[PDB]
Design a protein around this nucleic acid. Structure first.
Lengths: 37, 138, 205, 167
RNA sequence: CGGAAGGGAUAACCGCUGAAAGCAUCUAAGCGGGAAGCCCGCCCCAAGAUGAGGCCUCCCACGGCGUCAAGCCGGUAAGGAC
RNA sequence: GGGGAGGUUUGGCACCUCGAUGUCGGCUCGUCGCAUCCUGGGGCUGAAGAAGGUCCCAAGGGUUGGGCUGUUCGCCCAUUAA
RNA sequence: CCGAGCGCGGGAACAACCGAGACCGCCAGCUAAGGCCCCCAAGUCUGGGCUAAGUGGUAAAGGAUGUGGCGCCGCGAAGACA
């Protein structure tokens, strides 16, 4: 999931409180860490 | 008649602050003075525009993210000789440079266009060589 | 940040403790501690150092017999050690202690205009299958019709030799103040009669 | 702010207490003035940056005030086998899940306090500078390791497999 | 013998204290870690760096028309050239 | 199944070159690019540690000798941290 | 439209993109397009929205509590959102 243009809201803990100007998707089990790159 | 051409007038010196000021905007004013555009009898091929001693250029203000963004560049004829320096580091080490760079580019390119650059002394102080007159400006 | 001048000779192999070791021999000698340079009227600290005395009629003039103390110059005029300042007496050789690595300035002996595969070392090649001519030719330099501009510093055939250089890492076990000599690991550039000068190491300084 | 002595200088709000005094410089875009007994703040308007900076700043002062009303309580409950500690004089020493000993030592504003090897305590009088050190000792020895072994805030392990987890 | 040893800013990345958004957060303010990488610390050239830097000195003024303003003009000085 | 960079291959177009710019690899000198193979870094795993899988960061330097084929494409050995 | 308007400005530069038919001389003025902080010649004009990235200073599908405006159905002092 890391670095892919779909930074939705995957596992319902994952958040988009936009930082650095490139949305990350922040969760728990970090096989769920999508990124904007 | 036939347009009048000034005699050898006496160059008038001037002093300017700097700190708190905007870089571009500052030079913007400097240039028009390095030439006679401020004087009523400005003449193109002559060089009679006031000398300009600027003080403490070490504290000039700059908008946006310039401080970290703005990058000056120099190229030695050598391969990979490109050297680019950020406005941030230009202040630290010899900052009186920034104001100069900013102005030089804002003056003609010809022979005298550098001749007028010589008419400008900038100091990261304040403090100058108290040569003479030097009426502070705003 | 200590140091002292020197002049070049010999490079033997004396066997310290057990092992066998190559040994450069330089004469460090008495060198006029003629005055320091000061950060106000200069910008840093520096000491002028003379050397080996012969100068009579030939050199004279402002002498810096003026300077502040006279003493007359060597025959090897004088130089400087950067960021250096001893005590005030004209120092000699054993300014250092045996068994220490340090640095050295030397005039690499001249050679003149020389080969391309010699100066830099290219490769050249063409012995028999190539051509008789282009034995020692740089082969190629540039490009086609773009950029087509010959590069500044294209590593070219020319002079090599008469240069100057500092050098790091030199172990000196030997020294004979009893004649003014300094014997080190052995590598010093220059002819046996040229400029050398010992400064202090930089392994972590 | 009973027995504490607050004060506002230019943009920087200096806070002095029975503990000491800390520097709390925050933006001049509101109304920082000590009055009555408790400081107050009034945002210039209901504008974005102003709302944000307001909430933040008011909390920064409100905190740093207690920063000299004793905000020391924070410590680490180190777990694991060869995980030991012994604060000699001024230096915190430990040889945990690492070969050589370790020397963690006092910075300005905050203070260590070892009760014993397995649960080191910290009297840090600077809520900002303290937690720094907290997560920095914890970063010195990152715990977890699938099961256990390491230093923990009140931290709880997150489970995974030992001599397994290897298809 | 050398690449390095070391200081400082940064990468993605991890963290501190924290708001809008009473909860949360590595963030938009502030602190901190972070790479052979960027800048120095290394080595040569280098003041045509037409800002032509500065130090240590050296010799010294009119000697012939220009009184005034600049030229010029033969031999000497420290020196330097053949 | 759509959208796109990249202008290296392979197709299309034919204007300066018909008062010439001499096509394949190798010799030899490089040199610019990162979508980076070794090396640093960290994220993460259907990751115990050992190695691996993967995604971003990062040109600083480096990236072998041969057998055969005219041959880049290629296969093969002996190796490399690659 | 050029070609035959490579005559004149703009557009950085730029046969045909916009203005505009050059008999000739002037040291006058309206004006075209474009245009005014400074090159380079004329508003750091006046009045008001937005933007906070150099967007400006050349890309899409599509994505996103970016930041401000316009609105629709709830929950609200009977006590809500956390």
């Amino acid at each position: 999931m890391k670095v892919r243009a779909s930074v939705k809201r995957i596992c319902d803990k994952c958040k988009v409180i936009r930082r650095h100007g490139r949305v990350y998707v922040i969760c728990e089990n970090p096989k769920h860490k999508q990124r904007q790159g | 008649m036939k347009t009048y051409v000034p005699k050898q007038v006496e160059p008038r010196w001037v002093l300017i602050d700097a700190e708190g000021k905007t870089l571009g905007r500052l030079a913007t004013k400097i240039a028009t003075l390095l030439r006679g555009k401020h004087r009523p009898d400005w003449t193109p091929n002559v060089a009679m525009g006031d000398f300009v001693v600027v003080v403490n250029a070490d504290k000039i203000r700059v908008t946006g993210k310039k401080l970290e963004q703005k990058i000056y560049t120099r190229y030695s004829g050598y391969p990979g000789g490109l050297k680019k320096i950020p406005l941030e580091k230009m202040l630290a080490t010899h900052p009186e440079r920034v104001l100069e760079h900013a102005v030089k580019g804002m003056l003609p390119k010809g022979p005298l266009g550098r001749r007028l650059f010589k008419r400008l002394k900038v100091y990261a102080g304040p403090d100058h060589p108290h040569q003479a007159q030097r009426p502070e400006k705003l | 940040m200590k140091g002292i001048l020197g002049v070049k000779v010999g490079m033997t192999r004396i066997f310290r403790d057990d092992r066998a070791v190559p040994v450069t021999v330089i004469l460090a000698g008495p060198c006029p501690v003629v005055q320091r340079r000061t950060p106000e009227k200069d910008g840093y600290t520096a000491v002028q150092l003379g050397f080996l005395p012969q100068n009579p009629k030939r050199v004279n003039r402002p002498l810096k017999g003026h300077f502040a103390k006279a003493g007359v110059e060597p025959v090897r005029i004088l130089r400087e050690i950067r960021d250096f300042n001893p005590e005030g007496d004209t120092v000699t050789v054993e300014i250092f202690k045996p068994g220490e690595r340090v640095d050295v300035t030397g005039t690499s002996k001249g050679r003149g205009f020389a080969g391309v595969m010699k100066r830099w070392n290219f490769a050249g090649g063409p012995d028999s299958h190539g051509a008789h001519k282009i034995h020692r030719h740089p082969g190629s330099i540039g490009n086609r019709k773009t950029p087509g501009r010959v590069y500044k510093g294209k590593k070219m055939a020319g002079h090599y030799g008469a240069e100057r250089v500092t050098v790091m890492n030199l172990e000196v076990v030997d020294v004979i103040p009893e004649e003014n000599l300094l014997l080190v690991k052995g590598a010093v550039p220059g002819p046996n009669g040229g400029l050398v000068i010992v400064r202090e190491t930089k392994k972590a300084a | 702010p009973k027995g504490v002595s607050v004060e506002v200088a230019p943009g920087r709000v200096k806070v002095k207490g029975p503990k000491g005094e800390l520097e709390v410089p925050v933006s001049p875009e509101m109304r920082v003035v000590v009055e009555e007994g408790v400081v107050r703040v009034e945002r210039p308007s209901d504008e974005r940056r102003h709302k944000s900076l307001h909430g933040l700043t008011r909390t920064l002062i409100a905190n740093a005030v207690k920063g000299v009303s004793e905000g020391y309580s924070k410590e680490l409950l180190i777990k694991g086998i060869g995980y030991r500690a012994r604060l000699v004089g001024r230096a915190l020493e430990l040889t945990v899940g690492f070969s050589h000993p370790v020397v963690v030592e006092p910075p300005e504003g905050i203070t260590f306090e070892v009760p014993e090897p397995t649960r080191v305590r910290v009297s840090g009088i600077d809520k900002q500078k303290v937690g720094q050190v907290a997560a920095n000792i914890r970063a010195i020895r990152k715990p977890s390791a699938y099961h256990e072994k390491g230093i923990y805030y009140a931290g709880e392990p997150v489970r995974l497999k030992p001599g397994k987890a290897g298809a």
